[PDB]
RNA sequence: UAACUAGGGAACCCACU
């Protein structure tokens, strides 16, 4: 049952959700992906601290 | 709150959680645009 | 063609730029929004 | 059984890198050691 | 701390190149005059490269030290990495 | 003589890794 249509998503600046303005959650309401706890922890490993944020705060919910 | 405490937010998740920039390196340092080299550079067409 | 980069209008990509605008969106490899210099976006995929 | 011309080179070589392995000044070095032991607690088993 | 007492690494960082790199490209698609001759390129990113491989970028780099002090390195005072 | 934005949540269940 696991097919690639069923699957893809991309997102740029749709939905916005009301309680805090971050991007909807996942691909029916054309949300955005979670750049979650632990991605947060390797992009402080690599030191791409405008790449973090850029993530956190630019690309997000500015 | 309770002891009126501060945070110099020295640290990485305090920039991460206010949005600012880490220090965590690039962002350890600052930059300075030069004033004696920005005279040899041309005007590009 | 969804995921846009924002790309600044120098005189070197000026033509080029210009005929990915040309294009609009949906022709693939175009553009959908237009920011001014004031930071007012122009849609692209609304065909102004 | 070097030559002078290859001991020099030898030399520069040995300084040179060297000089790339130091630590880098700005090298997030707790996240870096945190991930580095957490990585291999995956793959370790109790029971294997 | 004059240029006698400035005690950070000659050879200039990963993240310094890497931030160097990005906000000198960002000020040449902003339209700022090219240090460098370049050979005809549209991609701002290769420019800075090549300004970069010149020692010509027009930026000093302030070094904070962990104490409150700062050194003020010039791009071509420092070794670059590669 | 083209009127141009989107709206909720909470729980459970299942699946992927």
Known sequence: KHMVDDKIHSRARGPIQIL???????????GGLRFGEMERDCQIAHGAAQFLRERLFEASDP | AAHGESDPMKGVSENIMLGQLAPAGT?????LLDAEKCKYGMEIP | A?????????????????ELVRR??????????????????????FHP | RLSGEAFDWLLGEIE???????????????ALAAQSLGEPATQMTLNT | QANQKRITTP??????????????ALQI???????????????????????????????????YLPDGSYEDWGVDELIISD
């Open chain 1, 20 to 30: 805090n303005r971050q991007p909807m959650e996942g691909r029916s309401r054309d």
């Open chain 2, 27 to 31: 962002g350890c340092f600052d930059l």
């Open chain 3, 2 to 18: 969804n995921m846009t980069f924002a790309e600044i209008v120098t005189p070197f990509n000026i033509d080029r730029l210009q």
């Open chain 3, 24 to 45: 609009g969106n949906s022709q693939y490899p175009g553009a959908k929004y237009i920011i001014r210099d004031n930071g007012d976006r122009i849609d692209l995929r």
């Open chain 4, 16 to 30: 040179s890198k060297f000089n790339q392995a130091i630590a880098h000044p700005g090298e997030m070095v707790g």
């Open chain 5, 11 to 24: 050879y200039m960082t990963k993240y310094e190149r890497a931030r160097v790199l990005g906000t000198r």
């Open chain 5, 29 to 63: 698609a902003m339209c700022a005059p090219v240090m460098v001759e370049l050979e005809g390129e549209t991609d701002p990113l290769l420019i800075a490269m090549k300004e970069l491989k010149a020692r010509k970028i027009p930026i000093i780099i302030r070094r």
